Ligand binder design. Structure first.
Ligand code: ZN
Ligand code: ZN
Ligand code: ZN
Ligand code: ZN
Ligand code: ZN
Ligand code: ZN
Lengths: 481, 321, 481
């Protein structure tokens, strides 16, 4: 009927199976173990082998490599390695059932039903929607009935990611400042009726003295929308919130300080900051987490025109500070100078903000870890531990005065959107945003190196990554618990 | 520090692979008679099967010198050492994979790795610290010529691994593939290496902190605490497999001096060097963002910085105590 | 024991097998046909499926897609498509036996024992030699005993290519002007004792008034070698020859007119011209073809130094013409101004020359076809027909006066190594070489777009391509016959 992803570890006396496959072997009377011997060398990590006709109702059975049974937290990779073995491994497996065009598949729990589900679901995702030429659409259910809410936690966590991924990936002519707001509101509302959405327009933004956000919007003839998300998780609604903030440029052409044509099509995912955090709130509502969260996202585009933002311009942020706009591509910093100010209105506990802010971050760590600068070691630890579980690493970076200094000197104004020099790129951009924040537990996450995947993360196919949505969701689960 | 600074700063026509060795030996010897120096030449290097170091040297008509420093600090001389390693390109023009003229005069301080660590050993001898330290530094220049290192070349490091040399400016990685191998000969405790290795480090942290990747959290802490005292900060960076992978795939050879992509610049370069090290307490310090000062560090005037020599010295004082 | 690459076509009533697999089905008593049904959807062109334990002595059996049985010459692709199906298809198959680490494999003739062998052999090749980390070394023999000299013709033709490929691919510090000469001489001599080699040195070159070749060599401190190959194929030795000529820069850095670092490591294959043609003569000697062929190749490197060739320089070719050397990267043209002159000494019939000459050729056709300019429609046809058989296409390009004109005007000298403008890149370079040739049947083949493979040619793995060695060999077989 349908396919099966089964698993095996690496040697003891005979390389063992995850019990479900030990059990499926008994079932086809040793003929799985036996054909695996006949096939060739053993299956190391995330390597795959397909065995036809072993079972009457499982014509294709893919056995995938899970590595060492007792693989655990790694001091060097700063993750739980087991989970990582299982994700790459059942992603691998699920992508094999899928090339065989088997529309459904049952997955071996592999000792961690959540890693299995985060592998099967992140593993299989594409964004097929505008290609009339699509791969088969395969339904992936758990094999078994024992470990069900952890597999659904995998499906949940990986699905919150695939949403950031679709929200990122879609061409920015479809994915506008209005359409993103609309899908996020429909997604947050299906998640919890204990929610409110506000797709606030230019009049409200104008009214909110958001000059910096608004200066950025004006080049395009596409409407700005400041989005406001509310999740009423706590028992007493009056609990102070945890506010997520995120930059939402639907398309970044650089503006007058215009980008080069080389691969500029990826700028459609410069709204990755707004996508990431939104998908993460949708998931804590889906999880129905005992915390009140607020989601904030400036949405607009960065375009050249007869009325675009010019180099040398002093605009005013909500908080009275003026910014010299010396480079029109440094606009996420400006979009975020106002949504960050508005975050203090809400009286929060933690203000996590996220943004595909600078390529220098990409030069720095470049898809290994997502750089997070925070004036809070508590907050750092909190993020870093979630990174170990989820596997979507996060690395700390310096919010030293050293850097505020280069952005704080300014010919016309109070702050300047770029620093005096080329060096320390992600650090000057983060020390510019510190100027718009006075809350003690603040964290900037620069998502610009983890924007994309190719081969680096296994269980993620080539394209927009939606990183770090699960670390973020894992942080709010641990914080709620 | 001001010694690393003078050793950095001097125009690389004066500050050669032979003159650096000579000033370091005179400085280490005035510091302690409990020292030995070896300004080992091309014949010794050739003999030490240092193909990677040696491939780099061949473009220039200026002699290579592998420098070897010994400080006999311990009571029992047989104590295992702490080996410092450091890249010493007296001048980096990029070679055939040649640099742009814009401010290339600063490449005279691409021997900053060898300067930093040397100045730091001279100081622990001056301090007469109860530890045996060993200083190792490939010195040579990177030049274009009729016999320079070409793009696409497989050379062999001392340890049998071959390197595809796809970019002749990635040469500190190669100079350091052999001095790092030789460091394990000495049976060390800690192998601290230091190098003005990549500009991407400069794009990363850029003179705030000196990026240090280490397979040793103990070593990280040890460095980071010294940074707090001295003020010459040091920031940790990732020595993740993620990065070994992009350098470990290679058309002709075993390792490749640059990675498949532009991203994670300092991390691929550091995960290439991990391939030449098997010791548990290893630390790469990329000095390329702290190479220079202007206004950023106050008490340092404009020019070569000599960073992080004092964090390094402070670490050996705390380690000896 | 060992593996088996079997084949199947696309539908009739039930998609048929190449008879060997019809026969292997009878042998495991229908259980191959039967498991193929159980496996999933049918195998279209060059798609693959592995079936373990069907046979006692064939544990892994890969069935590969051969497409339509009656696939033939294509008016649009200008090839025999069948052969092409079979190459990509048993390459695919053989690369699957090889990941299973089965050291030997038997290949289904697939209706054309030569295409099967050109697929198995080009398909499996790597250049593993400097990696201590190598894939398994798999021996590929024919399955069967009926069609043996055509399979050996595949093995021959594909092996002459893998030689150009190894001769190209090796890092130019190993593959010198002396080492190439040495491997070619050992290869030509194992091929036929009816051969002579001359690894002529700088003194001979100096003596041969080869100022243009020699100007190029002088930047490097690596010795020039002009190589001279002789294959005495004819009955009467006095038959006029067919002279192949080819540029052999072991490494091209551009010289003083120096290349950019971006991917310059591939310049090690700027000796691809000398490799291609040499490998092609070695094969006609291996074939023992009734023709006398002469192989000519300037070998040297292009380097910057205290005595490198400078921009603006007038050097003298063997034939009295002077060249303004305005760009030191236009050196293949110069290396070839002298080997082409020397070709007329031999009193030839056809002078085929080949060179990784210009990137503009790569901008032009770019790995589809290898551009061949010829003052001989006869020669064009002759080449183009060989292209249809082998599949390694060749496209004609213009040797119009139009282009001689831009290279023929010159401030200091008679000819100039680059033309007045950017346009028509491969055409100016070829109309410069026409100036050094007076023979009626001349053909320049610019190999610079077919220098490399990735995914474009299936049965060739990523790396140096060795194109068009088989079209070239096929031309000399047809010319000898
Ligand atoms: Zn921008
Ligand atoms: Zn942006
Ligand atoms: Zn360099
Ligand atoms: Zn360097
Ligand atoms: Zn050239
Ligand atoms: Zn060339």
């Amino acid at each position: 009927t349908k396919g099966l992803v089964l698993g095996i570890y690496s040697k003891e006396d005979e390389p063992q199976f995850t019990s479900a496959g030990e059990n499926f072997n008994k079932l086809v009377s040793g003929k799985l173990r036996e054909i695996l011997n006949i096939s060739g060398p053993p299956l190391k990590a995330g390597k795959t082998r397909t065995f036809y006709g072993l079972h009457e109702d499982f014509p294709s059975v893919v056995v995938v490599g899970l590595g060492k049974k007792t693989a655990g937290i790694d001091e060097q990779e700063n993750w739980h390695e087991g989970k990582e073995n299982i994700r790459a491994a059942v992603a691998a497996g699920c992508r094999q059932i899928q090339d065989l065009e088997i529309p459904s598949v049952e997955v071996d729990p592999c000792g961690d039903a959540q890693a299995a589900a985060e592998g099967a679901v992140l593993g299989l995702y594409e964004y097929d929607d505008l290609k009339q030429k699509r791969k088969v659409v395969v339904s992936a259910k758990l094999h078994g009935s024992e470990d069900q809410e952890a597999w659904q936690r995998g499906v949940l966590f990986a699905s919150g990611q695939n949403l950031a991924r679709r929200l990122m990936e879609t061409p920015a002519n479809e994915m506008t400042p209005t359409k993103f707001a609309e899908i996020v509101e429909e997604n947050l509302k299906s998640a919890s009726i204990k929610t409110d959405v506000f797709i606030r327009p230019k009049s409200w933004i104008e009214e909110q003295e958001m000059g910096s956000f608004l200066s950025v919007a004006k080049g395009s003839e596409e409407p700005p929308v400041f989005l406001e998300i509310h999740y009423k998780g706590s028992p007493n609604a009056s609990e102070p919130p945890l506010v997520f903030v995120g930059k939402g440029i639907t398309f970044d052409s650089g503006g007058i300080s215009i980008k080069a044509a080389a691969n500029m099509d990826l700028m459609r995912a410069d709204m990755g900051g707004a996508a990431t955090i939104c998908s993460a709130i949708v998931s804590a509502a889906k999880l129905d987490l005992p915390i009140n969260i607020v989601g904030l996202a400036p949405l607009c585009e960065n375009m050249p025109s007869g009325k675009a933002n010019k180099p040398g311009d002093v605009v005013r942020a909500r908080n009275g500070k003026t910014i010299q706009v010396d480079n029109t591509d440094a606009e996420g910093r400006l979009i975020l100078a106002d949504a960050l100010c508005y975050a203090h209105t809400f009286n929060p506990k933690v203000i996590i903000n996220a943004a595909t802010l600078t390529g220098a971050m990409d030069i720095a760590l470049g898809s290994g870890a997502t750089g997070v600068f925070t004036n809070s070691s508590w907050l750092w630890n909190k993020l870093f531990e979630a990174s170990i579980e989820t596997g979507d690493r996060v690395w700390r970076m310096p919010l030293f005065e050293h850097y505020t200094r280069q952005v704080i000197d300014c010919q016309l104004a109070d702050v300047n959107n770029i620093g005096k020099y080329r060096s320390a790129g992600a650090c000057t951009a983060a020390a510019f945003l510190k100027e718009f924040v006075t809350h003690p537990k603040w964290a900037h996450l620069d998502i610009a190196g983890v924007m994309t995947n190719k081969d680096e993360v296994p269980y993620l196919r080539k394209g927009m990554a939606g990183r770090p949505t699960r670390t973020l969701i894992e942080f709010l689960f641990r914080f709620s618990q």
